[PDB]
């Protein structure tokens, strides 16, 4: 994976963000980038080759892995970075926009008040979204075992799941990676509201 | 993959490109190739290893899964990306050459503004050609089971595909990436027009 | 693994630190990152696809596995780095963040002193913690045979693991590079008190 | 495969070349190294890993595919960017000697409209004689079934190979840019004959 | 393996060091770190994956290849180059520290020749050091076959190695290397004495 | 394969350099590297993964691979690399040698033309070398059969090799590519003796 380009942008973001707003770029590019390229992807690497199903039915680990993972979980970090990340581009891009008119003619107040907050609105709305969705495909904890009664398999046939406890361990550790950064968002409403 | 040459090009464009074409560009380096290389690849890498038929027959396999899938679709929209590129290459090319005769001698207008409002038209017939070409090839549905009858497989085999479901998820997102795209294109004729 | 970023904002630290914590951020960079990437990785690469466990069960090998190696060594040894990496980050923000201030109104004293000790003790407490935590998981070696009896193993079966002998070197290495940390935190410290 | 270097010695020839040169390199970069790069080679990772014949003997496969395929096609490709892009050094050499003596002492004219205009025809007799060799070593289809009577094959056997579909897809895609570099070269020559 | 970091702060070094130094830092760069890259790691890469034992006994391979070889040859050729490179880092420290005095005021002399000459002496003890541990772990020669009584192997088995030929080179080879190495700390030496 | 610190020197070079050793350092980094590695190093990824013996003994493979292929092709190309660009850079050193004598004070003559000639002399002998070893390790066509006696082979056993003929292709190629680098130096040999 490479987010280079992203990076530069966020960067450029930062040029021009709260301090609260560097703090959770920060964590964006720490906790969840470097880390779902570092530790998660590893972990991931062989969630379908090492996935062993009970069975001498031809297509049945397949469709049982298809519906275990409908989408695997690394996947679904990938677009929540970049969901949360959209919003700091709009800003960003509305900001040079205005620049570049001042530079044309030749501090947050009016249209970018009201795009900065507006965007942490939706970085807010996007991660709590994302939280819940994850709760609702998997939970928090994968267990070793899946029962999977899915064509072609004949009657119930178990399954069983590559690192089940190490993926429990890292699910959780970005759930709590978007609680803090959803906890950030809160601090910055709250510094501006003052 | 490396995008780095295309990327300054783009980059060089966005110095002179309109404030949708900015957005055009940026929704291509994050929502299309970024998710191109970090997520759908590694879905993509074991299309044929994980790609299972009930048979005995040699050969059986590799000529379903040629039937299956012609072309992959990770391949597809690599070469989506470039077509839907070429136009702005072409008018960041006019608009340097140019300014290299402006050079020699010592804000869109006359035959610059007839190139970028072409290469907008052109832009959008790529994009829509793709996605009805992508329609016709696979339709928006990876199914499980897919029956083949080419020898040399005797009589109709039935055969599976590796993530099924995670792969219509990535499709039915990139189509909805290219839709965004042909919105912005219009929009960018609009703002022209007015 | 990328971690350019974190290089990037610790040099930034580097050039606003005591010689105690250029050295500390050298120690880090060189025998730590740069020793997990060229030699510890190679080395469980294949932790899972080399761990045979004596059993003709289904599911046998991927639970007892699991059950093993809850967490890989070279994961938490991520997770470590990232973690007594942090505070560093605290620092070098405030200290930034007074920076900005002070362009606004146009040398370690007051908050800035608070925070660096602050800080120090912060990396000193996660460092003690992860290798606490590291003897309680694994203790410091690995021994080549593992017995299983977790379901769905028949009875206790004997499992394998693969290259324990270089994984108990390294764990002893990382531990006392670690070791080697604190002490420089200690360093740091008696010197401030000075 | 890294291009870097020959990449900013096309640039740096790409300052001292014809508007229909820039594009010739354009197309060079984009519709041949960045394919090879993100498309074919996928598609040719596994040409002989999913190689199957119908046979028990052993090495048949190996002497088939190293008969079936003598030089793999990306590998062809390689070798043609290479031979098509060293007159461009060439020319590029003889102008930077130039600007050398001229510096010693203290816009085509002379020897470097010989050199650039010798140097377009070498171009084109490459780019031509690539394609003939291609056409006279596998034409421009892959077909599926291959058969083979090579020792120690008994009798001839049936191989099959992986993704002829693809392939001829992106061999046709190669020929057909191929095709567009002669064309170039032809309008460079017609520029210059003006 | 990515050495960039070690690399800069090593050029850094190269910057203030003496010609036989820098002779010492690109035998360093070329031949050690540059092998390991292109050459050694592909040696190696298949050292288990390829290691074959002559047995039916569950985890008896394992045990025996970690027996054979308790620590790959490439991870400890890792190791040397780090240990030997860290004195030189020492130096630099202590010389950018007296730079930076002398910035705060307003060619080896006194602590900085004690330094570079004690690093010097470091350097020499680490090379020999590890030669010494090198030839009694492994001596210079890889043999082919390994026999192996190490539970649960039944009596004594054989196991064979992969590529035993193109190892006892490159062993060679670093050793010659170091060798040199370890001449021109003492051309250093002398150089200095006189 | 990282060859960007040598390819940084070897530019430092060509600032300093005859235009026929600049076109040697072209035709290195181009015909031998950029080869070495988009293409030869794919040809020769599976040499002993692809490489079938017919034969049930264990350890036979093995043993025949090393004995067939002592040293890997690409592996004795990546050391021709190295030490044939040494030479060049000691002539660099002695150059910058001067250079900062010469600011301490504070275009081929003396011990400069003396150590460029030799260097050119090095560089010959080293590339008739390695290319005269080479002969008599492989010769120039790398046979699809290989007969091998070697322990534990019960009698002569028959092996296959893979991709023989693409071997030998690139063989040759290199071959040729060295030829040329020889005649490059004979040219520079004259045109000093001018
Ligand atoms: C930009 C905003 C993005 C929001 C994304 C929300 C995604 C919600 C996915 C819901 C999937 C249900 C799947 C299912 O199988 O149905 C649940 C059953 O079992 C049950 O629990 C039945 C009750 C289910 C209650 C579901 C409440 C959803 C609340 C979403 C709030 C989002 C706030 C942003
Ligand atoms: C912008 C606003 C977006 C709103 C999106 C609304 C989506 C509404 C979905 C309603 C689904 C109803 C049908 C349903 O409920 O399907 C049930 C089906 C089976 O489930 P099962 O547990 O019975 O069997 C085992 C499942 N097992 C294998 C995963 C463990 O599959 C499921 O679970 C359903 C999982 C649904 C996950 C939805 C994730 C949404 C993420 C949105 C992110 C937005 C970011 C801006
Ligand atoms: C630069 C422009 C690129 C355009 C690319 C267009 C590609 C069209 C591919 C059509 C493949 C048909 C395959 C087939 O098997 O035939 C369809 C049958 O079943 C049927 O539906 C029979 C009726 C088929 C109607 C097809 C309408 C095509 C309209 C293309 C419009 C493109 C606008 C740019
Ligand atoms: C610049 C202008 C370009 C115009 C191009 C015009 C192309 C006209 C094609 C006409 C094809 C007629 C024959 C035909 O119809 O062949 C039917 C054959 C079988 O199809 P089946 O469904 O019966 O069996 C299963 C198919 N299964 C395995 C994929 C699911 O294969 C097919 O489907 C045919 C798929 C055709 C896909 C065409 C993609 C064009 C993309 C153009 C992009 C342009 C960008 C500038
Ligand atoms: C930021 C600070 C992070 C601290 C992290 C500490 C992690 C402690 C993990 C303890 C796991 C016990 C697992 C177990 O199975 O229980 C041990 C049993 O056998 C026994 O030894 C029973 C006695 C166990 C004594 C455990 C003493 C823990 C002291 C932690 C001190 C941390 C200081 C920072
Ligand atoms: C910020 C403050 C954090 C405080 C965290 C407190 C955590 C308290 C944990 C208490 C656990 C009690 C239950 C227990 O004891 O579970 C026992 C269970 C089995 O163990 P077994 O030996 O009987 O069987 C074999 C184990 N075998 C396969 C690994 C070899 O699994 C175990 O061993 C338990 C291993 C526990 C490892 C804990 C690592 C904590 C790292 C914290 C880093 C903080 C950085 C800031
Ligand atoms: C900066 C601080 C650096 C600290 C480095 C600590 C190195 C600790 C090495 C511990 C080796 C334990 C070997 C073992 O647990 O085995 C036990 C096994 C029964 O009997 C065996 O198989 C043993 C066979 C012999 C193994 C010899 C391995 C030598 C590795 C030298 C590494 C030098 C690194 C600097
Ligand atoms: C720098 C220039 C590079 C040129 C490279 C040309 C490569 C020609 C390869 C010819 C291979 C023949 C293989 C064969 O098996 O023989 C063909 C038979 O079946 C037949 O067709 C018999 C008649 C074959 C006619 C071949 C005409 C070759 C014309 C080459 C023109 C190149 C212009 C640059
Ligand atoms: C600088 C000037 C260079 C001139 C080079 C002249 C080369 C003259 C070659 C004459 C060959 C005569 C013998 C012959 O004809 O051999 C026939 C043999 C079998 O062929 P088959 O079809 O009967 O059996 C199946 C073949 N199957 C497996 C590939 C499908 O193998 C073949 O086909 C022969 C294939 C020949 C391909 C030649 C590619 C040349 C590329 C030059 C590029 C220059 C760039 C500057
Ligand atoms: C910073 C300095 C690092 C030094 C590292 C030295 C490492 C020495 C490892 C010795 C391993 C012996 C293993 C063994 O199995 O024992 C040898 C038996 O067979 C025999 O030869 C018995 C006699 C063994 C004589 C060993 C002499 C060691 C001299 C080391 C000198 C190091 C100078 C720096
Ligand atoms: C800073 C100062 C460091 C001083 C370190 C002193 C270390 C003293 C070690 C004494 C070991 C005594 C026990 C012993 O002798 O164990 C014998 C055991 C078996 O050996 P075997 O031949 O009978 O069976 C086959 C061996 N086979 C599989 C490898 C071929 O394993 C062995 O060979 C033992 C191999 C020992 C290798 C030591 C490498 C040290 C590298 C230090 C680098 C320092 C850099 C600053
Ligand atoms: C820096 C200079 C590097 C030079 C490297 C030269 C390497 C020579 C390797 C010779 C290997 C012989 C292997 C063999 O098995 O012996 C050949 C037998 O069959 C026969 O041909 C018997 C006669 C063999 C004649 C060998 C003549 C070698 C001439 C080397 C000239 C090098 C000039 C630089
Ligand atoms: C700086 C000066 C360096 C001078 C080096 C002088 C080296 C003298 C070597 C004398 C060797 C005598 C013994 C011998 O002849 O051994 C014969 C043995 C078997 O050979 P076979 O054909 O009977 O069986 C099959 C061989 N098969 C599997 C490879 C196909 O293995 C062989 O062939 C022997 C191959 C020898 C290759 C030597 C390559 C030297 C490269 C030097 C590069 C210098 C760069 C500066």
């Known amino acids: 994976?490479?987010?280079?380009?992203?990076?530069?942008?966020?960067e450029e973001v930062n040029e021009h963000s709260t301090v609260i707003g560097?703090?959770?770029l920060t964590v964006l590019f720490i906790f969840r980038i470097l880390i779902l390229g570092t530790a998660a992807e590893f972990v991931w690497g062989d969630e379908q080759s090492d996935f062993v199903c009970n069975?001498?039915?031809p297509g049945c680990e397949n469709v049982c892995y298809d519906e275990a993972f409908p989408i695997s979980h690394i996947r679904?970090?990938?677009?929540?970075?970049?969901?949360?990340?959209?919003?700091?581009?709009?800003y960003v891009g509305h900001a040079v926009h205005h620049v570049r008119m001042e530079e044309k003619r030749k501090r947050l107040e009016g249209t970018l008040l009201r795009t900065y907050v507006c965007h942490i609105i939706f970085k807010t709305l996007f991660e709590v979204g994302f939280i819940v969705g994850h709760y609702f495909l998997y939970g928090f904890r994968i267990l070793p075992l899946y029962r999977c009664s899915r064509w072609p398999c004949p009657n119930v046939v178990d399954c069983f799941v590559s690192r089940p406890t190490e993926k429990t361990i890292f699910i959780l550790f970005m759930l709590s990676v978007?609680?803090?950064?959803l906890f950030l968002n809160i601090l910055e409403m709250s510094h501006l509201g003052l």
Chains 1, 2, 3, 4, 5, 6 share one sequence.
Do not use: E
């Open 1 to 10: 994976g490479d987010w280079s380009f992203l990076g530069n942008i966020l």
């Open 55 to 57: 069975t001498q039915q």
């Open 178 to 181: 978007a609680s803090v950064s």
């Open 76 to 90: 679904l970090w990938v677009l929540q970075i970049i969901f949360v990340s959209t919003p700091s581009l709009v």
């Open 22 to 24: 560097r703090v959770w």
